[PDB]
Amino acid sequence: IPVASPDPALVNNPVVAATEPSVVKIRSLVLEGTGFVISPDRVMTNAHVVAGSNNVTVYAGDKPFEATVVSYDPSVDVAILAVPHLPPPPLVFAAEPAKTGADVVVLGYPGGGNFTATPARIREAIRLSGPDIYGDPEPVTRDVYTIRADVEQGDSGGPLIDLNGQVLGVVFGAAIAETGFVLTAGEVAGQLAKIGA
Amino acid sequence: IPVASPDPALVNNPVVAATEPSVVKIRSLLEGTGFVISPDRVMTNAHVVAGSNNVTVYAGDKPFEATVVSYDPSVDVAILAVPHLPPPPLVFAAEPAKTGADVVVLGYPGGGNFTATPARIREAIRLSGPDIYGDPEPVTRDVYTIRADVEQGDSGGPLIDLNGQVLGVVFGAAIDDAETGFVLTAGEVAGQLAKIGA
Known part of the structure; x- marks a missing residue:
């Protein structure tokens, strides 16, 4: 479906700064992706970023946090990580x-x-x-x-x-x-x- | 694209009887089919056998221990090694x-x-x-x-x-189709x- 091109000014929309702290970088095994906080100390990401890994790190504002896969299935696109001591709030x-x-x-x-x-x-x-x-x-x-x-x-x-x-x-x-x-x-x-x- | 209905007589084509011995049932710890591609080597669906350490191939309605020897998550087919498998390659x-x-x-x-x-x-x-x-x-x-x-x-x-x-x-x-x-x-x-x- 043809829609108008996205608004370039969205990069500077106040919603970005407000949401940014809760959007985190994921490094696994090296597989790289994005995740976000969904409840305190819990991050959702793509299952393919973390699949089979016992070695996942979450980065929030330039600092590493050990992460553990707590919900995962190969039939499912999303996975949940437990991340102790993760400061940002859930989205x-x-x-x-x-x-x-x-x-x-x-x-x-x-x-x-x-x-x-x-x-x-x-x-x-x-x-x-x-x-x-x-x-x-x-x-x-x-x-x-x-x-x-x-x-x-x-x-x-x-x-x-x-x-x-x-x-x-x-x-x-x-x-x-x-x-x-x-x-x-x-x-x-x-x-x-x-x-x- | 639309084609005629399949010929029901194909079930009775002698080539089925001739090739049947080389077509094997697969059980892995999932079920599927495989076929002999060279002596003691069976091609099958990667997804039947993915990561499985226990794979049985059935040829004469007789079980044979099989092992996944060629596999990668990027590839749709896998090759199984099956010692003492009688039937010939297709x-x-x-x-x-x-x-x-x-x-x-x-x-x-x-x-x-x-x-x-x-x-x-x-x-x-x-x-x-x-x-x-x-x-x-x-x-x-x-x-x-x-x-x-x-x-x-x-x-x-x-x-x-x-x-x-x-x-x-x-x-x-x-x-859908x-x-x-x-x-x-x-x-x-x-x-x-x-x-x-x-």
Whole structure:
């Protein structure tokens, strides 16, 4: 779905500074990604960043914190880390769906470098379906937002936020088109239940 | 693309009887199908056997201990080593299959008995998905789409042509389109194996 290009000024939106401390860098095994605080001392990230690792570090404002995988399943895109002594507060998920054309922001760590807010716009909420690959862990079907944005693998596990600073979903991929894929809040809810989070 | 319904008579084609001994049931600690590609070597679906330390291959309705010897999370097929496995290798077809061609899926639906599932080639296509971050599997694959009553138990099984040669490896089904299977082409399989030095 064609939407207007994202608003470049979003990088300087006050929501970015307000949300930034709760968006953290993840280093595993070396696999790199983004996560965010979802409750005190608990970080959500992409399962593929931490899969099978007993050696995960979370970085919040340039300082390392030991992390332990506490909720994980190969059939699920998201994972939860326990992070003792993690100062930043949790982010809160938005109750209702984002709307077509809405200004939104991807927050994360492109290239494993510094924090960057990536301006974005909601294209559409869709049912993303693939072929049933026999025995393949990945879900066959996911509720996602397609967003107009130039996302990068370093943003994986990072939140898509609305302008209120609430979390609309989790970045997990990109079209093979200036189009990112984001798990919806409802999709995340269902996945969390699966892993006992 | 739409093709005629598969020929039910294919179940009775002698080439099924001739190739059957070389098509094996796989149990791993998941169930699937495999086939002999060289003496004591069985090709199957990577997902049936991924990370598994306990794999049994059944050939004469007789169990054989198997081990995953070629595997990578980025590759859809795996090779099993199976000491003292009697049946001979199936041979891969040198030529691609055409639209409308009579073909047969050989495998073990539901982890039960050997069944030949009549099939027909729809098309050779590129199967593409989104770039799922951190997912090691191929974003694109050369496959045949086929018309057939496939089932997850068939995974890792050969799609054979009327010469009893292997066109590809059964690896999935369509969710929206009924009676539609996906089969990794011979070239796709060779290419993936080469990537991991197998």
